[PDB]
Amino acid sequence: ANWRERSDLTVTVGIGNMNKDQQMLHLMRIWEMAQAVVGGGGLGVLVSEQ
Amino acid sequence: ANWRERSDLTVTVGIGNMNKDQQMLHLMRIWEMAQAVVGGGGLGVLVSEQ
Numbered sequence: 548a549n550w551r552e553r554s555d556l557t558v559t560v561g562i563g564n565m566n567k568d569q570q571m572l573h574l575m576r577i578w579e580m581a582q583a584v585v586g587g588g589g590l591g592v593l594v595s596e597q
Numbered sequence: 598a599n600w601r602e603r604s605d606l607t608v609t610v611g612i613g614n615m616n617k618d619q620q621m622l623h624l625m626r627i628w629e630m631a632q633a634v635v636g637g638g639g640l641g642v643l644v645s646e647q
Contacts (some may be wrong), residue, residue, distance in 0.1 A: 566612060578630065585637055596642065 557563045564572065584594050607613040614622070634643045 574626070582633060590637065596638065 555561060555563070558565075581594055587593060590596065608615075640646060
């Protein structure tokens with residue numbers, strides 16, 4: 548079809564944090580609290596490997 | 598054949614981080630998180646030795 552719809556909220560003011568900000572968020576936040584949760588109680592009950 | 602196609606994105610502004618950025622990312626991002634995976638899950642829990 549024509550699909551009649553596009554989203555560009557990954558580029559600019561539409562929040563779209565650029566590659567630098569994306570790397571910043573990933574490294575300091577996502578992986579770090581993932582490690583904290585995993586080392587907290589375990590893996591299976593806590594954050595899944597999936 | 599002629600192959601009618603080229604691509605050299607690994608050089609410049611198109612993110613293509615130079616050898617410095619790539620080697621530092623491997624030094625303290627790729628190995629650090631890979632070793633965290635090995636310690637937590639192991640070689641075979643996530644992607645294997647390949």
